[PDB]
Ligand binder design. Structure first.
Ligand SMILES: *Cc1c(COP(=O)(O)O)cnc(C)c1O
Lengths: 62, 239
């Protein structure tokens, strides 16, 4: 069932990356006094440790 | 900063006559003219005299004995060297930071040469000074904003009291006009660390080899208290 559940997740994530233009990813701004523009993720919106991130135009990595 | 040096004498007349015509033109814009002797004379007018910004010498006489010693003392020092027809550079003059301004020996054009030296000197002032200090000197001669802090406003309240005139005449007009708060837009705010203040902190860190140097406006005794309160919470251990 593990090799069969991966095909369901792959099919589910395939339909979510097609409509990714509706919900993008806005990062909060907090560049105060530091040698580099630090960033931070979303607060209560995301709480998982190993979360996934989708992309629009696919690239050939590795 | 108004010292112009004219080194050496070629003995001819078509080269010394433009020097005499330029001698009467540079004095109209407040400039001191000095006549050094040999090569060792010009070297003493730089280490001991820091208010020098003009070196006039013949390019076809000392093209390697002057472009090497001056480069070892100042990089942006203007060199008003006068070249001739058969003049060229040297292979040993590629890895040296110099500012050579070429001219000719044309009569009657001494007025146009004086305007080029004054504009070149102004470029030297706007280059060696940081953008924070340069903006402060320019704000005095142009920026004249009203209804701002402090209340003296460049020494205005001191000109209405007998006791205030003695305190205003001690420093100078440019001293009181340089004391401005954060009520100026084209200079930024120190607490915000933006605009001219942002590039000023990054400039000091590059000179002293640092990441982002700061400028404490209270002294060393205060800087040790701000840093100490960082890595020492309410209940820790310091060494
Ligand atoms: C002299 C000194 C100070 C005080 O310097 P200020 O800039 O005048 O406050 C602070 N710490 C040490 C180690 C000093 O020698």
């Amino acid at each position: 069932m593990l090799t069969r559940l991966g095909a369901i997740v792959q099919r589910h994530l395939q339909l979510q990356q097609q409509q990714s233009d509706k919900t993008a990813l806005t990062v909060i701004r907090l560049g105060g006094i530091f040698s580099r523009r630090q960033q931070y993720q979303l607060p209560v919106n995301v709480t998982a440790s190993t979360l996934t991130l989708l992309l629009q135009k696919p690239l050939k990595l590795h | 900063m108004n010292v112009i040096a004219i080194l050496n004498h070629m003995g001819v007349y078509f080269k010394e006559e433009p020097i005499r015509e330029l001698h009467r033109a540079l004095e109209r814009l407040n400039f001191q003219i000095v006549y050094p002797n040999d090569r060792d004379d010009l070297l003493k007018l730089i280490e001991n005299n820091a208010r020098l910004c003009g070196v006039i010498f013949d390019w076809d006489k000392y093209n390697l004995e002057l472009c090497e010693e001056i480069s070892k003392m100042n990089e942006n020092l203007p060199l008003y060297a006068f070249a001739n027809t058969y003049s060229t550079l040297d292979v040993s003059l590629n890895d040296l930071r110099l500012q050579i301004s070429f001219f000719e020996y044309a009569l009657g054009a001494a007025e146009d040469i004086a305007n080029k030296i004054k504009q070149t000197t102004d470029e030297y002032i706007n280059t060696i000074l940081p953008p924070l200090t340069k903006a402060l000197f320019k704000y005095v001669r142009e920026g004249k904003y009203t209804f701002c802090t402090p209340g003296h406003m460049g020494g205005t309240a001191f000109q209405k009291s007998p006791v205030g005139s003695l305190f205003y005449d001690f420093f100078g007009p440019n001293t009181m006009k340089s004391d401005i708060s954060i009520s100026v837009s084209e200079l930024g705010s120190l607490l915000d660390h933006s605009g001219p203040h942002k590039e000023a902190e990054q400039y000091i860190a590059r000179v002293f080899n640092a990441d982002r140097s700061y400028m404490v406006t209270n002294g060393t005794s205060t800087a040790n208290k701000i840093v100490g309160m960082y890595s020492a919470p309410a209940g820790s251990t310091i060494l």
